Amino acid sequence: DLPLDPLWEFPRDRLVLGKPLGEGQVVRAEAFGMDPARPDQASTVAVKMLKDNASDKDLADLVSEMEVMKLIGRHKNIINLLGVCTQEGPLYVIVECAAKGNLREFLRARRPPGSSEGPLSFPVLVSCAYQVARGMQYLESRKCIHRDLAARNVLVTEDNVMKIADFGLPVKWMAPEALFDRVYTHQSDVWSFGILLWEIFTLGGSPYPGIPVEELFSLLREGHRMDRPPHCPPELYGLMRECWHAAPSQRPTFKQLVEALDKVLLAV
Numbered sequence: 001d002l003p004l005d006p007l008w009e010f011p012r013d014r015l016v017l018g019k020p021l022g023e024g025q026v027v028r029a030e031a032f033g034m035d036p037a038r039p040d041q042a043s044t045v046a047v048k049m050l051k052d053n054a055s056d057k058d059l060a061d062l063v064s065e066m067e068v069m070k071l072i073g074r075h076k077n078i079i080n081l082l083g084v085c086t087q088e089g090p091l092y093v094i095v096e097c098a099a100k101g102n103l104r105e106f107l108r109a110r111r112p113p114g115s116s117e118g119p120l121s122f123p124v125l126v127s128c129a130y131q132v133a134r135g136m137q138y139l140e141s142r143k144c145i146h147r148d149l150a151a152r153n154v155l156v157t158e159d160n161v162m163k164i165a166d167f168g169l170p171v172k173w174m175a176p177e178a179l180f181d182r183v184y185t186h187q188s189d190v191w192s193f194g195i196l197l198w199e200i201f202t203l204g205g206s207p208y209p210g211i212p213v214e215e216l217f218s219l220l221r222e223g224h225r226m227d228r229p230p231h232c233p234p235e236l237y238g239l240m241r242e243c244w245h246a247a248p249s250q251r252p253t254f255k256q257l258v259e260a261l262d263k264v265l266l267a268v
C-alpha cells in the first residue's frame with residue numbers, strides 16, 4: 001500500500017503490456033497519452049515490475065529507484081521516468097524506451113568490413129561522447145554517482161540520441177580508488193567515461209584486449225594505459241588519458257569534458 005503521487009500516477013488501463021525485454025522483469029508496452037498535450041497519441045515505453053518470486057526487500061529497491069528517478073528529474077541524455085502505477089495492482093515504473101539498444105551494440109553493428117569507411121563519421125562519434133558527457137554532468141549536478149558507466153549502460157533512441165541507463169540503483173571500467181578502496185566519486189565516473197570514450201573510437205571494443213582480468217591492476221599500478229586506437233585523433237586520445245590519471249583531482253570534470261568535446265564539434 002503506497003502513496004498516490006499526483007505528479008507521476010498514470011492510469012493502469014492506459015498501459016498495454018507487451019514482450020519481455022530482460023529477466024532477473026522489464027516489459028515493453030504501448031502507453032496512451034504519456035504526453036497529456038496529445039492524449040490519444042500512443043508511444044512505446046519500457047515498464048519495470050517485480051517477478052512473483054520477490055521478497056519484502058526487492059519491493060523497497062524498486063520503490064527507491066522510482067523515488068530517485070523522480071528526484072533527479074528530466075534530461076535529454078538520460079532514460080527519463082514517464083509515470084508510475086502504484087494503486088490497486090502491482091507496482092509499475094514506466095520509463096523511456098530506446099529503439100536501437102545499448103551503445104556497445106549500436107557501434108559493433110555499424111562496423112565497416114575491414115579497411116572500408118562505415119556509416120559512423122568522426123563527428124557522429126564525437127557527438128555520442130558529447131551527449132554522454134552532458135548526461136553525466138546533469139546526473140552529477142543532481143548528486144548522482146553512476147558507479148557503472150560503460151557503453152553497455154548507454155541506450156540509443158530512434159533519432160541516435162544517447163541516454164544514460166541504470167543510474168537509479170566490470171573491473172576494466174573502474175577507477176583504481178574504486179577497485180582497491182571501494183571509493184566511488186564523480187572523478188571515479190570520469191575514469192569510466194575515459195574507458196567509454198575508448199569504446200566509442202574502437203566501435204565497441206573490449207578494453208585492455210588480450211590482457212587477463214588479473215594482470216590489469218599491476219599494469220595500472222606500473223602506470224600503463226590502453227594505446228591510442230587506430231584512426232583516433234590525438235586530441236581525443238589525450239582526453240582519454242586525462243580521464244586515466246591515477247590521482248582523481250587531476251582528471252577533468254564532466255564540465256571540462258563537455259567543453260573539450262564541444263570545442264571539437266565546433267571545429268567541424
Ligand SMILES: *CCC(=O)N[C@H]1CCOC[C@H]1Nc1ncc2cc(-c3c(Cl)c(OC)cc(OC)c3Cl)ccc2n1
Pocket residue numbers: 021026028044045046047048065066079093094095096097098099100101102155164165166167168169
Ligand atoms: C523501445 C523499443 C524496444 O523494445 N527497445 C529495445 C531495443 C534493444 O534494447 C532493449 C530495448 N530498449 C530499452 N530501452 C530502454 C530501456 C530502459 C530500461 C530501464 C532503465 Cl535504463 C532504467 O534506468 C534507470 C530504469 C528502468 O526502470 C525503472 C528501466 Cl525499465 C530497461 C530496458 C530498456 N530497454
